[PDB]
Symmetry: D2
Subunit: 429 residues, 4 copies
């Protein structure tokens, strides 16, 4: 029935001011507007969005609409919504169901309000984390035959997509947006490099300099976190299950040990694994007084937050999403955002510039699926490298980067199109 | 007349939460309390405090008090007070006069409230920037001979103490706390390394990576700001007048040029000079669209905000302390905190750990002035190197540092006492 | 006829001392010895090697032999051979045809002496740069039917392999060793990070701090070079044809412009493109006095060295592989190793630890091709990821890295073998 | 008696090549020549020089000479002389006594040759480490009153000048050149940042990346060595006695602990303390296999080489200045340069650019002492800040730095002369 549902529509004006500033920071999305506003390649699309409802996401949403699509939106995390952002989208006349600090039930509710449009069920999915994807496959399968495609933002979501596919249970063609190079090596890496510390700082205002910081996982996210921490004068310790990642981290000058060891040394703990059971009771019990513990992976499964609730003598809320626990042993643990995504949970997520790479990849994927479905049979697909290169290209102007153009002789020497793609498929950048 | 004036005494319970956390990050101040809470060296002291009313200052104030002093407090900047810290201090029955967003009229009023104690006038000054010092020399000279001592926090205020002495204005002994090693080369350096980005990020959420950031000045504050922005992937340009500082910046891989040049290139501008007329009209008319401009030196004379107010077509307020000016060239300038301290004005200032160095120096200074008048004629003095080292030593344990101890044979060889000082008076660290 | 041909067999003892020290640095190669010395998986193999004849290569050579193979060796660069290393191999009784400062004819000669063994023609190729591969395909095709496989070390060599294959002209199955992750993200990246500056320093002893350094190309090699230069206080400028690489470099805080621009600013120039025509006459003529110019890509085609020889007023040899040119314009250019590989040309190549990753990959490839030819039809192949992970694993012990082992529950959550591989094929690390 | 003594006068033509190059990296020294070659301020000076006989010193010597001085030279370390630099200086008709690999007997002989000029005894000392100073005070006191001045290069020698004064031993005015800002905080810092790794690499070709490097001391030399090893991916542990330096290292993300602890962890050991008994038997018996041990502080008392010589089962010489000791535990220690200066002993010392700062200070000191005796009583003096800044200014242009110029209004505001000094005497930079 409702046109939207947000925390306070009164925050619309401020949101709009924030949207204005962010647009000017997001040239990938803006170029998409220049190119495709007239031709409206998305007319007919009915896109249900499940993705952190922030200022950046607002710019993506309004890009989808300018491209002719109908869009309904919900956040993919109970803490991540930026209320002023949601307000602006709602006031603009776009159905959005999102607010900071939802309950687990308000969460599923919001998502369901994205499923039905004036003209019928949804026919495109833009998902971050697999939640909207899974909800349709298991709760509303009858809607699967009317969906042309899914595009998936984050590494956990795509992981799930692969597992669905190899189990025969995926029924809609899916583009893996996470593993666009202009996503995974930008958003995951440099985004977290700037938003992790933001989140810790806003929550706790602790000094990084002189701390021991333990980062679990050294993939794209863990790389960015580690480097951000080291940059501020923290001594950074890494844990890893993958020998290749571990050698990388050792070659960069980090000590790489087990959580079972590092729990006794760290003052700050950051989980980036995307895997269950990373920081447990046995670890909490050995930590230094006032350890800070927070997770940055997509789901809050990495930290045993239940163990704290059940086993602490004392639990004091310092403020929204900041909890201080007193244990049997007389020491305290500070826990951030109840173990959910700390950058989005306790701050404002990645900054808008890098998000423009992510969101540009999303737009192209939506066009690709909507306009070229034949290209995309049931399964999980990458964007072509030429498009990947295009998104990066689109962001060079704003940083005043001058790109070298190959001469004809050069292109022939390298046996390469003068216009790219400039790399083979297996290139790792 | 008021027993205190704050924004909201209701914020006192949160404030106390914040204080409990802070104390645990501030072993220096705590060592001071466990050492002198019994003997009460500041028995009889009446300290008037003009210094940013933050959580960190709260802990400082309570240290003073537990050491027997009576204290009355105001903030030394109009935007830097933390309301919950102020409230927690007022709730504890300590007269404080401070809130975020005072007018210039209210600012002077607050400093005035600190002059008079039930038992007569102030006999001690603790100052950051020298406004309290100037006010009593300029406007209340009859109180001068009743004041035993001044301790001064910051580069600007300490510079002013030097000018006053050499002009025969200064009528009270002063201690130069800024130029303690454990202050200048820690709080100035590492403090700003963490709190500059925090201010920019909270205000604007801009991405540092890929930007050109121009840092005016490369003293202690400049070094820290530059390193911070470098660390996140900004390309940093420095301006300097001092050939030594200039050569230092160059040897660290920073381009050094003039504002005249650099204003055409920067996306972000931080002044750190302590000097007037750093960024002017001619710089502004040449800046890239949406250039972010802010100041981190003690007073707001570095950026010609006057020029923006008189010349802009339109000033749009974004949120407290964030303004977007539209210029006659069609470009926009984002100014933070009306050109006042960005870290304190837009974030939370330095974290508590580093403030513990500065504040421990502050406490020792008060003790030295009040307990040992005879040692300090009218002039500007440094704390002894012995105490300077003590401050450092007192933060070691919290970080799990194991300092080495000279053997007798080594001490003999180096010709120093086993227990310090370990460095000649001219040592630069 | 000859058993070997080296600069001076008298350098054998010193070489052996150097080999002893390096073994202890190369656990990948040593584990290969433990595992396979008894079973001799390479008995019957007749491996012709064309790869820089350094201490590290010596350890690989003796690993091949311990694994049962017959080996004959030549260097793949006229300047790269380490004479004491070649001496040790020769004195050990292994046919080696290698010495520092060969002529272009002595070079082809050496390579040809690797082709024939006591029992017949060669049947395995271990190549770095495609030279031995190409020589057989075009000069001695009659030997192609008796070769089981090729393994290729460097990015230029594999590029060529791909071009051969898609032109129908490759006739032997080839493993791409370069693009093992434990090669490309280690050897290319961290190797050059340490050997580029080594090479510049030994040649010229210049101060990096305060210089402008221009690095052409920002792939694996360019990444390592850039970071090494920046680490010493050089201001680093990057050129690139690939938008993705360019954005990476901009996001790390480097200025990215064209050579046409950078030629006027740089004091040091490093080419890492693997492409022709990077630094030309038009560039040389605009460079600062005493610019240093050197190449680190596989072939000496990147710098127009002919243009210098033809157009300089004056050419003075400072010492082996160090040339100083005086131009028409009165300024000087310093050119390193006549434009050939500077790390190997003017120093000692990558250090032995990282080379162990490279060489371990080589050994596995040789075993793979020799022992499992059916697995490898004509074409270009990667090592399986499980083997890639094995090489990294083999190096963890020596750095005292402790790797986390997945629990059963965890492995099931991630839907992954408890033992790896832990990453999908498209992962970029 | 000899007009000079060098290893080979035949190396003079290469040496001159090296000199031509060096001069171009040393604008400070050149400025000095273009300024004073006419007026000849050192007319009548007879400077005896004891300072590492390197290319850089050659340029220094020639500057002195062109300024009218007569000069006789010896090296201040047995392994640091560069034979071609020595030869080029001897060929130019300047008495020098210096070669790489002197015995202790030859070392003292060489210093002796510098005392007597055709016109009678030396009237000026230019010293690095204080051996020339000690020798004339201890053994030739009758020459004392004939000497006008001493200028002293290094921390150790300058420390000794302080001890001699405070013991009433020092009978000549001395200038403390080390503690020039443009010296200590450049040559000590950035010099070692480049020349430490060069020494290790030339000697051993070990990989820094992934190693644990232990750095004893964290003064200016320690800071530079630590940064260098960090930059290449070593994990660096610091030891310190000074709580200030210790806290600094901690705030930069380095673990700080004791040698007693750290000797069990390090792969590489650099002493920087200037102090005796840093690495002892108990450290050696606990080190990892093939630990590399070296010293970069001025004399060789930091590592107990005596212990290794008496206790090792077997010492294998590898090449000049590289020894591998076999221990009774079966492990090996690699000692560099018999525990003497590793950068100068195993490589080429600092590059010429930074030496130009130190040497320009050296020249100004000689000018000040010789031209203005009246200004300098017996004691230890600093150069004025004005000259300190001049040195810096003189290196700016070569780096294309544009220093800003205070307007009159700013200078008035800051209360300083437009042309400096820009900093109070206590400023630490
Ligand atoms: N804005 C954000 O907060 C943000 C950004 C992007 C991605 N993510 C999420 O972050 C997580 C990681 O993303 P990524 O791109 O770095 O993925 P990734 O695949 O690169 O994985 C990180 C690493 O975790 C390691 N790991 C797994 N289990 C481990 C264990 N038990 N102990 C230690 N290490 C372990 C793996 O070896 C892997 O290298 C995912 O959940 C992803 O969706 C969050
Ligand atoms: N938390 C904070 O915000 C904080 C912390 C410490 C001090 N400060 C303030 O920051 C300012 C700088 O402090 P500092 O301790 O680094 O002082 P400093 O003297 O070490 O550094 C200031 C530098 O600015 C340079 N400079 C002066 N005028 C200039 C001009 N016109 N253009 C370019 N460079 C110029 C000077 O050469 C000097 O090197 C002072 O006002 C100080 O009180 C703020
Ligand atoms: N020991 C060594 O010296 C050593 C080590 C490994 C590789 N190599 C050689 O180094 C070269 C590069 O290796 P890599 O692994 O970094 O390869 P890479 O494919 O990562 O390429 C480097 C980059 O060069 C860029 N490029 C190409 N033409 C250009 C041009 N005209 N201007 C600017 N940029 C241009 C490409 O965009 C690419 O990103 C190859 O020749 C390789 O064989 C040498
Ligand atoms: N080119 C070169 O090789 C070069 C350059 C400059 C100076 N030096 C020499 O290097 C040495 C260090 O020089 P600096 O200028 O850094 O002096 P510094 O006083 O700044 O640093 C020495 C540091 O060592 C610490 N220390 C002393 N004894 C120690 C111990 N037992 N354990 C741990 N730490 C200890 C001291 O606290 C001090 O901080 C001196 O001998 C100096 O002459 C060599
Ligand atoms: O500010 C933001 N707005 C929207 N999405 C964001 C922001 N910051 C990070 N992510 C996204 O969150 C995913 C994990 O769920 C990441 O993959 C990232 O793309
Ligand atoms: O969090 C804080 N609380 C209180 N004072 C602070 C904080 N951060 C920085 N300063 C102080 O502000 C002065 C400049 O006016 C600096 O000298 C610094 O010590
Ligand atoms: O010290 C070395 N010994 C042998 N090969 C080396 C060394 N350093 C680098 N390379 C190799 O040279 C290739 C380019 O021809 C690189 O790919 C690298 O693996
Ligand atoms: O290349 C060089 N030539 C000459 N002296 C040098 C060089 N590098 C460092 N030092 C000098 O050696 C002293 C320690 O004995 C240092 O003070 C430094 O200035
Ligand atoms: Na954001
Ligand atoms: Na704070
Ligand atoms: Na090597
Ligand atoms: Na040198």
């Amino acid at each position: 029935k409702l046109p939207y549902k947000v925390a306070d529509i009164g925050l619309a004006a401020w949101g709009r001011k924030a949207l204005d500033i962010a647009e000017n920071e997001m040239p990938g999305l803006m170029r998409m507007r220049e190119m495709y506003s007239a031709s409206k390649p998305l007319k007919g699309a009915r896109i249900a969005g499940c993705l952190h409802m922030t200022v950046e996401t607002a710019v993506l949403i309004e890009t989808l609409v300018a491209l002719g699509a109908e869009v309904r939106w919900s956040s993919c995390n109970i803490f991540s919504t930026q209320d002023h952002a949601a307000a602006a989208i709602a006031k603009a006349g776009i159905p959005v169901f999102a607010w900071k600090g939802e309950t687990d039930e308000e969460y599923l509710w919001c998502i369901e309000q994205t499923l039905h449009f004036k003209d019928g069920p949804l026919n495109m999915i833009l998902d971050d984390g697999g939640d909207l994807t899974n909800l349709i496959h298991t709760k509303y399968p009858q809607l699967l035959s009317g969906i042309r495609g899914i595009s998936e933002e984050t590494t956990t979501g795509v992981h799930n997509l692969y597992k669905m596919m190899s189990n025969g249970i995926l029924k809609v063609p899916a583009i893996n947006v996470n593993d666009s190079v202009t996503k995974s090596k930008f958003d995951n890496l440099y985004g977290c490099r700037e938003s992790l510390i933001d989140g810790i700082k806003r929550a706790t205002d602790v000094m990084i300099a002189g701390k021991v910081a333990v980062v679990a996982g050294y993939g794209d996210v863990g790389k960015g976190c580690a480097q951000a921490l080291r940059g501020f004068g923290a001594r950074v310790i890494i844990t890893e299950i993958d020998p290749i990642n571990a050698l990388q981290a050792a070659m960069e000058g980090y000590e790489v040990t087990t959580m079972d060891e590092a729990c006794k040394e760290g003052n700050i703990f950051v989980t980036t694994t995307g895997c269950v059971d990373i920081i447990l009771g046995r670890h909490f019990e050995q930590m230094k007084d006032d350890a800070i513990v927070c997770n940055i992976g997509h789901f809050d499964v990495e930290i045993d937050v239940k163990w704290l609730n059940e086993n602490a003598v004392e639990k004091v809320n310092i403020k929204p999403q900041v909890d201080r626990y007193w244990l049997k042993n007389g020491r305290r643990i500070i826990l951030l955002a109840e173990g959910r995504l700390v950058n989005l949970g306790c701050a404002m997520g990645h900054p808008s510039f890098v998000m423009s790479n992510s969101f540009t990849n999303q737009v192209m994927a939506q066009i690709e699926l909507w306009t070229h479905p034949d290209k995309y049979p049931v399964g999980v697909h990458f964007l072509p490298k030429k498009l990947d290169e295009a998104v990066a290209e689109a962001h060079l102007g704003k940083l005043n980067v001058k790109l070298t153009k190959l001469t004809e002789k050069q292109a022939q020497y390298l046996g390469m199109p003068i216009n790219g793609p400039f790399k083979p498929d297996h290139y790792r950048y």
